Scaffold this motif. Structure first.
Motif, mmCIF file in Angstrom:
data_model
loop_
_atom_site.group_PDB
_atom_site.id
_atom_site.type_symbol
_atom_site.label_atom_id
_atom_site.label_comp_id
_atom_site.label_asym_id
_atom_site.label_seq_id
_atom_site.Cartn_x
_atom_site.Cartn_y
_atom_site.Cartn_z
ATOM 1 N N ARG B 149 0.829 -1.197 0.000
ATOM 2 C CA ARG B 149 0.000 0.000 0.000
ATOM 3 C C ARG B 149 0.866 1.251 0.000
ATOM 4 N NH1 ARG B 149 -1.734 3.018 4.396
ATOM 5 N NH2 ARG B 149 -0.884 1.327 5.682
ATOM 6 N N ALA B 198 -9.005 7.128 -1.452
ATOM 7 C CA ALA B 198 -7.849 7.723 -2.117
ATOM 8 C C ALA B 198 -7.783 7.364 -3.596
ATOM 9 C CB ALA B 198 -6.543 7.339 -1.418
ATOM 10 N N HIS B 249 -11.537 6.984 10.026
ATOM 11 C CA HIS B 249 -11.133 7.654 8.797
ATOM 12 C C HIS B 249 -12.299 8.404 8.175
ATOM 13 C CE1 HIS B 249 -9.500 8.672 5.004
ATOM 14 N NE2 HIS B 249 -10.008 7.657 4.330
ATOM 15 N N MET B 256 -12.441 17.038 7.936
ATOM 16 C CA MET B 256 -11.680 17.699 6.884
ATOM 17 C C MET B 256 -12.595 18.510 5.991
ATOM 18 S SD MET B 256 -8.617 18.108 6.159
ATOM 19 C CE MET B 256 -8.195 16.790 7.280
ATOM 20 N N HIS B 263 -12.637 27.627 5.190
ATOM 21 C CA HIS B 263 -11.880 28.292 4.131
ATOM 22 C C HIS B 263 -12.461 27.814 2.808
ATOM 23 C CE1 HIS B 263 -9.164 27.052 7.512
ATOM 24 N NE2 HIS B 263 -9.081 28.364 7.635
ATOM 25 N N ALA B 265 -13.811 26.022 0.006
ATOM 26 C CA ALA B 265 -13.109 25.361 -1.080
ATOM 27 C C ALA B 265 -14.118 24.779 -2.057
ATOM 28 C CB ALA B 265 -12.191 24.259 -0.552
ATOM 29 N N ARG B 300 -7.099 6.830 15.345
ATOM 30 C CA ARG B 300 -7.110 5.864 14.254
ATOM 31 C C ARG B 300 -5.729 5.260 14.052
ATOM 32 N NH1 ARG B 300 -8.123 4.227 8.996
ATOM 33 N NH2 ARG B 300 -6.208 4.398 7.761
ATOM 34 N N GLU B 301 -4.684 6.081 14.150
ATOM 35 C CA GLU B 301 -3.331 5.546 14.042
ATOM 36 C C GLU B 301 -3.020 4.591 15.187
ATOM 37 O OE1 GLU B 301 -0.381 6.163 15.948
ATOM 38 O OE2 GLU B 301 0.761 4.860 14.603
ATOM 39 N N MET B 304 -4.744 1.354 14.453
ATOM 40 C CA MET B 304 -4.244 0.607 13.305
ATOM 41 C C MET B 304 -2.885 -0.014 13.597
ATOM 42 S SD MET B 304 -2.773 3.411 10.559
ATOM 43 C CE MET B 304 -4.122 4.569 10.658
ATOM 44 N N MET D 268 -6.467 25.197 -1.515
ATOM 45 C CA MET D 268 -7.175 23.945 -1.739
ATOM 46 C C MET D 268 -7.401 23.685 -3.222
ATOM 47 S SD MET D 268 -7.439 22.529 1.145
ATOM 48 C CE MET D 268 -7.154 22.987 2.848
ATOM 49 N N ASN D 272 -6.073 20.481 -5.256
ATOM 50 C CA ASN D 272 -6.945 19.707 -6.132
ATOM 51 C C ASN D 272 -6.317 19.531 -7.509
ATOM 52 O OD1 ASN D 272 -9.109 18.349 -7.184
ATOM 53 N ND2 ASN D 272 -10.632 19.910 -6.663
ATOM 54 N N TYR D 344 1.884 8.115 8.733
ATOM 55 C CA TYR D 344 0.823 7.918 9.708
ATOM 56 C C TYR D 344 -0.508 8.477 9.237
ATOM 57 C CZ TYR D 344 4.617 6.755 12.889
ATOM 58 O OH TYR D 344 5.713 6.173 13.484
ATOM 59 N N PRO D 346 -3.836 8.708 7.135
ATOM 60 C CA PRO D 346 -4.614 7.663 6.456
ATOM 61 C C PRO D 346 -4.425 7.667 4.956
ATOM 62 C CG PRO D 346 -5.935 8.812 8.094
ATOM 63 C CD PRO D 346 -4.681 9.598 7.943
ATOM 64 N N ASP D 347 -4.211 8.835 4.366
ATOM 65 C CA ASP D 347 -3.892 8.960 2.956
ATOM 66 C C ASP D 347 -2.845 10.051 2.798
ATOM 67 O OD1 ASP D 347 -3.768 8.963 0.214
ATOM 68 O OD2 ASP D 347 -5.642 10.075 -0.048
ATOM 69 N N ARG D 349 -2.575 12.334 0.314
ATOM 70 C CA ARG D 349 -3.194 13.599 -0.060
ATOM 71 C C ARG D 349 -3.856 14.250 1.143
ATOM 72 N NH1 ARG D 349 -7.814 14.423 -4.836
ATOM 73 N NH2 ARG D 349 -8.725 16.334 -3.968
ATOM 74 N N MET D 350 -4.556 13.455 1.948
ATOM 75 C CA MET D 350 -5.229 14.021 3.107
ATOM 76 C C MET D 350 -4.234 14.434 4.181
ATOM 77 S SD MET D 350 -8.417 12.494 5.286
ATOM 78 C CE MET D 350 -7.407 11.369 6.232
ATOM 79 N N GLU D 353 -3.136 17.713 3.083
ATOM 80 C CA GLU D 353 -4.220 18.656 3.323
ATOM 81 C C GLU D 353 -4.282 19.061 4.788
ATOM 82 O OE1 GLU D 353 -7.999 17.745 1.751
ATOM 83 O OE2 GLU D 353 -7.290 17.571 -0.319
ATOM 84 N N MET D 354 -4.146 18.095 5.698
ATOM 85 C CA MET D 354 -4.065 18.418 7.117
ATOM 86 C C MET D 354 -2.948 19.409 7.378
ATOM 87 S SD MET D 354 -4.823 14.879 9.192
ATOM 88 C CE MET D 354 -4.986 13.937 7.680
ATOM 89 N N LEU D 357 -3.730 22.944 5.806
ATOM 90 C CA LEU D 357 -4.829 23.593 6.499
ATOM 91 C C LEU D 357 -4.430 24.009 7.907
ATOM 92 C CD1 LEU D 357 -8.455 22.640 6.474
ATOM 93 C CD2 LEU D 357 -7.244 22.294 8.610
#
Ligand SMILES: Nc1ncnc2c1ncn2[C@@H]1O[C@H](COP(=O)(O)OP(=O)(O)O)[C@@H](O)[C@H]1O
Ligand SMILES: Nc1ncnc2c1ncn2[C@@H]1O[C@H](COP(=O)(O)OP(=O)(O)O)[C@@H](O)[C@H]1O
Ligand SMILES: Nc1ncnc2c1ncn2[C@@H]1O[C@H](COP(=O)(O)OP(=O)(O)O)[C@@H](O)[C@H]1O
Ligand code: BEF
Ligand code: BEF
Ligand code: BEF
Ligand SMILES: [Mg+2]
Ligand SMILES: [Mg+2]
Ligand SMILES: [Mg+2]
Ligand SMILES: [Zn+2]
Ligand SMILES: [Zn+2]
Ligand SMILES: [Zn+2]
Ligand SMILES: [Zn+2]
Lengths: 370, 337, 369, 363, 248, 126
Positions: B149, B198, B249, B256, B263, B265, B300-301, B304, D268, D272, D344, D346-347, D349-350, D353-354, D357
């Motif tokens: 992954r 994703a 998640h 998020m 802001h 988006a 979550r971390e 996991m 953002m 994207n 660490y 989850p994705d 890209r995210m 983003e975290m 932001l």
């Protein structure tokens, strides 16, 4: 090119006469007193940090017990059994890798062969090195012999950490502890050894290796043989430093003095000329951190600086007088963090430069103007 | 399932990844990086079928031969798979040891000697270091494959021997079209599935055909009562299904989207719950919202990574901490170090 | 200390050590159980092998001036050195205090020694019966009674053989599951009544050491110790206590069906039926009709075996299952070509005696197949 | 015939003499002088990061040590022993992968082996690699044979990280810290290799490949193989740029200039777009970190402009002028911690983003 | 499956193959770290089949003429393959059609078919292992040596059964000690024409070599108290053995 | 000075009397009344922490269950039955250390012993 030379100073210059054991005055005094007075315990436990002489002292005592008769305090001339002991020919000298005898059955096998005393000697000595890794059942098995063994069998156990092994074994007969050698004694030993081998030595190199050796003559001798290899049978200051990799501590001192003085241009000059010197950035940061801890140390006592630091003791005193403790701690925190994230910086030089620039921008007195 | 499933967007990559082997210049190792359920397994399977096939057809495997007939029966004597047992989760030193000790012998059918590790992240570091020699310098006509992954979590050494081939997720519109052809429902759900996963269409399929989607719906409804009332504890039953990582998640994705809504988006991930997004933005303060999102990701971390941790205790503490944070006068944490 | 001296020829030394090897070695729990005891008495050497319940003594004749004394030496190493040496070379053995020196030809060896660790009285009997059973008697008796006795059985007493001396004859009995053996040997001596149980392993040791069908033997049997003097050598074993079933209560069960005829024909038929006998329930079916026997077997392999035998019979039609192994041991130890067979019931014990003489009798409890 | 005459560059271009090794003069000089002068130590511990040459230096040392032509710092390379050790079929150089042989059975086997005579060479040498994961029992059993071995026994230890060694094991062997290879050394070695193998390239792609692989020549060659597998068997700037997915300074500076002015919507939208093109997020973060570093340099002394590219240096100069040093430091720290937490996340890209932001926090 | 063509084809008497395997079998590695050791090398050249086995402390080479012109070839057959090869061929039937391909070996023995896969790799050469300038020689009857070593091996150490050879003009001597501090010593009358020498062997390999040598007279060749020994038939040169000595 | 060198305190001070056992009165009273009343079980197990008294209480139970005075809760400690155990050698008492005896052969060897009657005592103690 080819040769038949070398003896590995570690494999050559082990004590075999009680006069080469440097330091550890307590244990040598105790052993001499016991041997001369004839009081010998049934179990010996030498503890201490690595590279200090516990194995060598064990061999020393073992050959002092069985050496062409005579209860001497180690000095023994024309002693055959001693010469086979130092030659690797086992004569009532049984070294045991305890890791190969962790199971209780193996130590039971060790127990049942305790009666074989008369083998060209008076005492048969057992060296169960790294004794702290025995199993509990094996500990109990050997405990029965520990409390009341045959007269002719002496136990000599060597370990690094006495905390691990059980209390009952700890308390049984004796527990001697060998302190780490000071850099001064390491200097003496390295100087003496390289004198014995008709090889010149710069005292700066001796001090560098002594401090680089963590109070252990085996580390010091490995590093010293590395230094001899790096040169050509001669140890020199620049070769030794390029071997360790440690930069000019004066280069780092000028860098931290510039950081205090808040002249970013001089900081850039020092960092780029240090880059041209081919030094590791992690090394630069850790040396600056050492200097920062030292400048915090002098805040509590003038004796913080070691003997070598006599070269730069005056600048230490000036920085200590000039800079208050809060600023030292601010710089220490900034640079310690910077080292923590150095692996994630885009480049090691980039990260170190940014950390210095941040310590400059968050300057307590004169920060970078907006 | 049976020979897994080929995926239409995978056809280009395989072609490229077979050219390097047609010319004979193929690096023995290969560390395919692809998202879960992305379709890397079919790629590795098809590659191995081409490699161990005695007569490699142009871009195909054989057409007809015993060399891959034994492959279809899954009983080839050279083809080795390294997957943890169905009852366990860590690949032990013993299986890699057996495979590598049996590699030193010649090729039984006179062809290649292909190995495959089903999932590299599951490899215990001791197994990785037992397999290091075999990867660095394999014998002649020996090839390897691996699936991850992510590569960064792998051992620093194992990836250094291998080529880090990458599987790009398909373009958003193409993935949406494929999923629409497969599963039928509103496009908001499909966009949520792709962006949550994703971009892995297989993972979106697993979300739909798996029960979790309905459970996801449940969570939304639960939050629809929690945020207007400041009563988050009632989320416990929603967040405990042995899917605490995935559900946390989804919660973090919602948060998020709310912080994105602040802001403002153009694009947000959750498009099936815009009213929930607006409500989450309305009730929650941005600093509190970011602290809560950080805690959600942290929990979550923690779940996991460490197996054997108690899910109920962790989620309960998380919900109590959130409830505490929604009270005014609290000091919020900030990531550091 | 006392020191010992020997100049002993190898060949006349091997047979004692080789014989006494029974109660020697074999996972010695103690440093003293796995060793052999040597002692000098007048002009003889006694070799003692011990395992805490069986003591085997061998008497090597001494022909040379030999220093008296006793010692304990590792039995296995002594046996190996005495065997590997060249044939006919006299071995010179000396006690070097804590060590045991042994020399031969151009070879020297030293051994570790134990001074005194296995020297109690070691034996004490009662000797109710002291029959001078000659060699050939107990030879055939024991080979006809051993069979395959109790292993792991909870009934401890069924392990050892039952000896009962009465009048001029000794009856030896053995029970194990279905099978039971008995032999009534006519010693011919006026002997007192006595009953005793001997351990099975002691029995096999006695039979194995026995050999040589010529010399009369002295057997002294008590309540806890049994001694047998097989010519030159001596053996002693413990004795199992009572609770053994009476052979006078298991042998005579009023047989009513009588049969006879060849034993080796039955052996061949039994072997051929064992191929298709039930592999889980060892045993085949025996159809008994007037002057006719039929043997049938149906193994789980769905293979049927059938044979017909001419065995005399004047009783009623019968169908008796039986274990092939037990009865095959009966036939093999009967050492005869013709046997007699008495049937009682399909759930009552079936007797099998020697058609040559009454001296050998056996019982097998039938099988339900 | 079909036996794959081709070999990967990561192994085909393995060093074969002390003159073929890229860098690490600090250890090659010491090793060669020790070979020549007559001082050879019975246990050598080469330690360093991945792909810097511990195994290669050890194998060259073995080649030299048991060459039949005396014991020279320069192995002949034509004899038998050189040839087998190069091929790895020599009896007296035994490769032990410490991950496997960590049970006490294998360690006892090794200690049994060390007591005998050699077979073909002067010295029987155990190349134990990844030593730092021998079980404690294995190390404690190995102490004796690592301390005072027989005359013809020498040990060569290879470890990825010295930390996991029991410190006592460190002390009995001769430490050689193989320095990570500098970008210049990697690029020059790549130039020499690619010119040798008649493969067209250009220096720019070499610099990109050197930068991507953090001081690991094997990694450089792995990326070379990846870059020649795609792009018709040649190395080009576009090919390596696509392979790495790296981005030009313009886009990263657009991100940092939108984020420094709290233009969250623009930030953002840029993220994207970057996802639409499918960039590598770690690359985005390293580019942002580099731009922030350059801005900080410009703030410190105006001399060190952004002149390596100097394409949109107007924006960098303006951003430096208009932002206090503290704010840039906070932006760098935030982006850096976020970079630390990509795995660490989850994705990927995210996670980015975290981080962005959160950088948007300041007003 | 289509059968693999053979590049090495020959046929052997059962006696020849049995002698070769008995001569070299005890001399091959078990699970040894060096992967190419756990097997047997079957070299063929001219009309001669040669067999090589090693474990880093031992070497058995056995050469027997075949009379069939054969190419120079090499091959390694692993532990299990050769063990069940020796098990497979036991009768007196002439057919031993041995086929060596690039990756596997097959020996046809009448109605039984041998099958195994070769250990990929190149075996070390034995000629480089046998000492090239043996300047010391010894001779003795095979059975005398074998019985002597078996007798002296009784009281040696258990796991590693080391023995010490003192070879001199007066006689040959062998001694053995064990962890039990037990001593064994013995003398043999071999014909020597040199000075004193001390060497240390392991009685297990020496005893194996003597047991499987199967001749009348045996000759030893020696160079140094650390170098390798070369034991051979004093009446033939079809089989040679080497035992790398032991450190003390 | 050299006190206890003859007999280690543990060995020297092995409780030969119930009054010599300090602590474990909850078990001591139960054992005493069970012996006096006759509620003797076929098997007794004790759980403790190393030097807690398990061997001491087991040997005391052996004294009280097979003393010459009979099954008594207060063993004399001077009779032949008591002194045989006190020295360590009692024919009908079989003390086994399971640490060195984990095999099935020796366990079966004792299994055979479970059947015969005691040689000198009233009951066989394993
Ligand atoms: N006290 C000492 N005196 C002299 N040499 C020492 C001493 N301690 C260590 N050494 C040197 O270190 C080498 C190995 O020392 P050693 O005793 O093995 O340390 P360790 O305690 O870690 O086992 C010795 O050969 C000797 O040269
Ligand atoms: N110092 C170096 N000089 C030249 N090539 C090197 C060097 N270090 C590594 N390499 C390259 O890396 C490849 C692997 O090197 P290796 O020595 O196995 O590294 P490691 O220390 O991690 O085992 C070699 O084949 C060579 O191409
Ligand atoms: N409850 C107790 N009262 C008196 N002494 C005790 C007690 N427990 C232990 N001891 C002392 O310890 C010694 C050994 O006791 P023991 O009962 O064998 O311990 P274990 O439970 O480990 O078998 C005894 O001789 C006695 O001195
Ligand atoms: F025994 Be020491 F730590 F080298
Ligand atoms: F890849 Be190397 F051996 F660290
Ligand atoms: F330590 Be006790 F005897 F269990
Ligand atoms: Mg040490
Ligand atoms: Mg390596
Ligand atoms: Mg106890
Ligand atoms: Zn002396
Ligand atoms: Zn096919
Ligand atoms: Zn060479
Ligand atoms: Zn009493």
């Amino acid at each position: 090119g080819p040769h038949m030379s070398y003896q590995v100073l570690a494999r050559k210059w082990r004590p075999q006469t009680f006069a080469d054991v440097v330091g550890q005055e307590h244990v040598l005094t105790a052993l001499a007193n016991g041997l001369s007075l004839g009081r010998i315990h049934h179990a010996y436990l030498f503890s201490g940090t690595r590279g200090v002489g516990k194995t060598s002292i064990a061999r020393l005592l073992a050959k002092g017990l069985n050496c062409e008769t005579g209860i001497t305090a180690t000095p023994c001339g024309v002693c055959d059994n001693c010469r086979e002991i130092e030659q690797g020919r086992f004569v009532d000298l049984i070294e045991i890798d305890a890791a190969s005898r962790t199971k209780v059955e193996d130590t039971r096998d060790l127990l049942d062969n305790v009666q074989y005393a008369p083998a060209r000697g008076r005492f048969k000595v057992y060296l169960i090195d790294e004794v702290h890794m025995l199993s509990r059942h094996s500990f109990n098995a050997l405990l029965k012999t520990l409390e009341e063994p045959p007269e002719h069998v002496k136990f000599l156990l060597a370990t690094t950490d006495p905390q691990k092994l059980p209390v009952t074994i700890l308390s049984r007969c004796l527990q001697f502890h060998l302190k780490a050698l000071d850099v001064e004694q390491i200097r003496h030993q390295l100087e003496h050894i390289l004198n014995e081998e008709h090889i010149a030595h710069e005292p700066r190199a001796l001090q560098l290796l002594a401090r680089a050796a963590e109070g252990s003559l085996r580390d010091a001798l490995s590093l010293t043989d590395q230094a001899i290899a790096s040169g050509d049978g001669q140890v020199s200051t620049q070769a030794v430093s390029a071997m360790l990799g440690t930069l000019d501590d004066d280069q780092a001192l000028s860098l931290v003095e510039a950081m205090v003085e808040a002249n970013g241009e001089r900081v850039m000059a020092l960092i780029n000329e240090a880059a041209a010197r081919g030094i590791e950035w992690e090394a630069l940061l850790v040396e600056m951190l050492g200097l920062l801890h030292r400048i915090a140390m002098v805040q509590l006592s003038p004796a913080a600086l070691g003997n070598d630091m006599a070269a730069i003791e005056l600048r230490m005193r000036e920085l200590a007088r000039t800079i208050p403790p809060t600023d030292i701690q601010l710089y220490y925190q900034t640079l310690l963090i910077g080292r923590k994230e150095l692996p994630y910086a885009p480049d090691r030089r980039m990260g170190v430069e940014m950390t210095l620039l941040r310590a400059l921008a968050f300057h307590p007195r004169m920060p970078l103007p907006e | 399932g049976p020979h897994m499933r080929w995926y239409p967007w995978l056809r280009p990559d395989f072609e490229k990844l077979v050219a390097s082997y047609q010319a004979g210049r193929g690096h023995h190792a290969l560390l395919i990086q692809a998202l879960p359920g992305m379709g890397d397994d079919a790629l590795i399977y098809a590659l191995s079928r081409y490699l161990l096939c005695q007569q490699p057809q142009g871009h195909k495997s054989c057409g007809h031969c015993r060399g891959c007939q034994l492959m279809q029966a899954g009983t080839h004597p050279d083809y080795y798979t390294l997957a943890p047992e169905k009852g366990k989760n860590t690949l032990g030193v013993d299986a890699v040891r057996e495979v590598t000790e049996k590699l030193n012998e010649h090729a039984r059918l006179g062809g290649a000697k292909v190995v495959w590790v089903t999932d590299a992240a599951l490899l215990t570091d001791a197994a990785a270091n037992a397999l290091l020699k075999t990867l660095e310098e394999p014998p002649a006509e020996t090839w390897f494959f691996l699936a991850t992954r992510e590569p960064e979590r792998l051992l620093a050494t194992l990836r250094s021997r291998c080529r880090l081939h990458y599987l790009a997720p398909p373009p958003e519109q193409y993935a949406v079209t494929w999923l629409s052809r497969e599963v039928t429902m509103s496009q908001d759900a499909l966009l949520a599935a792709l962006r949550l996963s994703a971009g892995s269409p297989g993972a979106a399929l697993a979300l739909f055909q798996g029960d979790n989607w309905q459970a996801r719906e449940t969570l939304c409804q639960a939050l629809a009562y929690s945020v207007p009332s400041g009563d988050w504890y009632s989320l416990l039953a929603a967040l405990n299904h042995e899917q605490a990582p995935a559900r946390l998640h989804w919660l973090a994705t919602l948060l998020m989207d709310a912080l994105k809504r602040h802001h403002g988006a153009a694009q947000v991930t959750n498009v099936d719950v815009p009213g929930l997004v607006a409500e989450l933005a309305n009730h929650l303060s941005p600093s509190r919202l970011q602290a809560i999102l950080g805690d959600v990701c942290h929990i979550r971390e923690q779940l996991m990574s460490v197996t054997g941790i108690n899910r109920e205790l962790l989620i309960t503490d998380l919900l109590l901490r959130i409830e505490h944070y929604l009270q005014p006068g609290v000091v919020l944490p900030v990531p550091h170090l | 200390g006392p020191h010992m001296k020997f100049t002993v020829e190898r060949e006349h030394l091997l047979k004692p050590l080789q014989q006494v090897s029974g109660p020697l070695g074999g996972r010695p729990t103690l440093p003293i159980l796995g060793n052999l005891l040597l002692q000098v008495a007048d002009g003889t050497l006694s070799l003692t092998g011990t395992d805490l319940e069986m003591e085997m003594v061998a008497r090597v004749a001494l022909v040379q001036p030999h220093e008296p004394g006793a010692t304990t030496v590792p039995a296995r190493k002594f046996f190996d050195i005495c065997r590997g040496l060249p044939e006919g070379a006299e071995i010179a053995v000396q006690l070097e205090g804590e060590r045991m020196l042994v020399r031969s030809g151009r070879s020297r060896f030293s051994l570790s020694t134990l001074p005194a660790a296995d020297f109690p009285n070691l034996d004490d009997w009662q000797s109710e019966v002291e029959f001078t059973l000659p060699q050939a008697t107990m030879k055939r008796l024991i080979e006809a009674t051993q069979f395959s006795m109790a292993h792991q059985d909870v009934r401890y007493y069924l392990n050892g053989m039952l000896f009962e001396t009465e009048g001029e004859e000794l009856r030896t009995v053995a029970t194990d599951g279905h099978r039971l053996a008995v032999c009534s040997m006519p010693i011919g001596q006026s002997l007192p009544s006595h009953s005793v149980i001997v351990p099975r392993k002691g029995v096999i040791e006695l039979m194995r050491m026995l050999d040589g069908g010529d010399n009369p033997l002295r057997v002294q049997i008590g309540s806890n110790n049994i001694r047998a003097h097989v010519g030159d050598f001596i053996f002693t074993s413990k004795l199992v206590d009572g609770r053994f079933p009476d052979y006078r209560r298991v042998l005579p069960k009023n047989p009513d069906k009588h049969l006879e005829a060849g034993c080796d024909l039955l052996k061949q038929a039994f072997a051929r039926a064992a191929i298709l006998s039930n592999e889980k329930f060892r045993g085949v079916r025996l159809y008994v009709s007037e002057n006719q026997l039929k043997i049938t077997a149906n193994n789980p392999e769905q293979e049927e075996a059938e044979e017909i035998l001419d065995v005399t019979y004047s009783g009623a039609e019968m169908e008796i299952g039986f274990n092939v192994s037990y009865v095959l041991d009966v036939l093999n130890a009967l050492k005869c070509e013709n046997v007699r067979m008495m049937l009682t019931d399909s759930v009552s014990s079936v007797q099998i005696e020697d058609a040559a003489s009454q001296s050998a009798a056996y019982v097998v409890m039938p099988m339900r197949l």
